[PDB]
C-alpha cells in the first residue's frame with residue numbers, strides 16, 4: 334500500500350467539525366503536532382474566500398490554515414502566516430456519535446506519507462481510529478506515525494489548553 | 496465615573512458567542528491585544544469543569560482562558576498556561592444581528608480600568624461599540640484605550656489570521 338492508495342473519505346459539512354471542537358491529536362507523524370489541540374472555525378464575515386479555518390494549537394503557539402475543498406475529497410489548506418499550500422485527505426471520519434467524534438487525516442508526497450493527524454474528542458476510544466492508524470503505518474514513511482500525547486506539559490486548570 | 500460603576504451587562508448564552516466566531520478586537524487598553532482575533536470554544540467533552548474557553552490569537556501566539564460565570568454578570572477567567580485568574584464584565588453585548596456581532600468587555604482593579612476588549616465581526620460598525628468605548632475612556636486609566644488595528648502585519652491569504 335502507498336500513500337496515494339489510502340482512502341479519500343468524504344469530508345463532512347464544516348458545521349459537524351465545528352460542533353466537534355475541541356479535538357486533540359492522538360497520532361501524528363512529525364513532532365510538530367504532538368500535544369496539539371485542533372479547533373475548526375467558520376469563515377469570517379469579512380472573508381472574501383469564505384473559507385473556514387483549521388487551528389493547530391500547541392501550548393501558546395498556533396498554526397492556522399484557511400481551507401477549501403478540491404478534487405477527489407481533498408482539502409486545500411493555505412497556511413495563514415506564509416501562504417504555503419498543503420493538500421490533505423481524510424482516511425475516515427466519524428463525527429458526532431454517542432461517543433463523540435474522531436477522524437484521521439493525512440498528507441502525501443506521492444507514494445510516501447509526510448504528515449498524519451488523527452484527532453478525537455473521546456481520548457482515542459473510537460475503534461476506527463487505532464485501526465486507521467495501523468493502516469497508515471503500512472505506507473512508505475508510515476513508520477514515523479506515533480502516539481501524540483506521551484509527554485505533554487502539565488495543565489494549569491484547563492483541559493484542552495496548557 | 497469609575498470602573499466599578501460601568502454597566503455589568505447580562506452575558507449571552509455561550510453558543511451565541513461561538514456562533515459569532517471569528518471576532519477581531521477594535522479597541523483595547525494595553526498593547527497585548529492589538530491585532531488579535533477572538534475565538535470562543537465550547538467545553539471539551541473530557542473537561543471536568545465543563546467551562547468554555549476564550550482564545551486570544553495574535554499571529555502565531557495564543558492565550559487561552561477557561562471561564563465560568565460568577566456574581567453580578569462576572570466572567571471568571573483561568574489563564575490556561577499559568578492558572579492566573581481574571582475577573583471580567585461586559586459593558587454591553589449585541590450578538591447575531593443582521594449586521595453581525597459586537598461587544599465590549601473590561602477588567603477593573605477597583606476604580607481603575609486595567610484592560611479593555613471591544614470585539615466585533617463587522618469591522619467596528621455597530622454604533623453601540625464606539626459609544627461604549629467613549630464611555631470606558633472616561634473612567635480612571637481609560638485614557639489608554641485605543642484602536643486595536645492601526646499597524647497589523649500583512650496577511651498571506653487568510654482573513655482572521657496572519
Ligand SMILES: *[C@@H]1O[C@H](CO)[C@@H](O)[C@H](O)[C@H]1NC(C)=O
Pocket residue numbers: 442443
Ligand atoms: C514533494 O517532494 C519533492 C522532492 O523534494 C518536492 O520537489 C515537491 O515540492 C514535494 N511536493 C509538494 C506538493 O510540495
Ligand SMILES: *[C@@H]1O[C@H](CO)[C@@H](O)[C@H](O)[C@H]1NC(C)=O
Pocket residue numbers: 456457541
Ligand atoms: C486517555 O488515554 C490514555 C491511554 O491511551 C490514558 O493514559 C489516559 O489516562 C486517558 N485519559 C482519561 C481521562 O481517561
Ligand SMILES: *[C@@H]1O[C@H](CO)[C@@H](O)[C@H](O)[C@H]1NC(C)=O
Pocket residue numbers: 604605
Ligand atoms: C489590584 O492592584 C493591587 C495593587 O497593586 C494588587 O495588590 C491586587 O492584586 C490587584 N487586584 C487583583 C484582583 O489582581
Ligand SMILES: *[C@@H]1O[C@H](CO)[C@@H](O)[C@H](O)[C@H]1NC(C)=O
Pocket residue numbers: 379618619
Ligand atoms: C475596517 O475599518 C477601517 C476604518 O476604521 C478601515 O480602514 C478598513 O478599510 C475597514 N475594512 C474594510 C474591509 O472595510
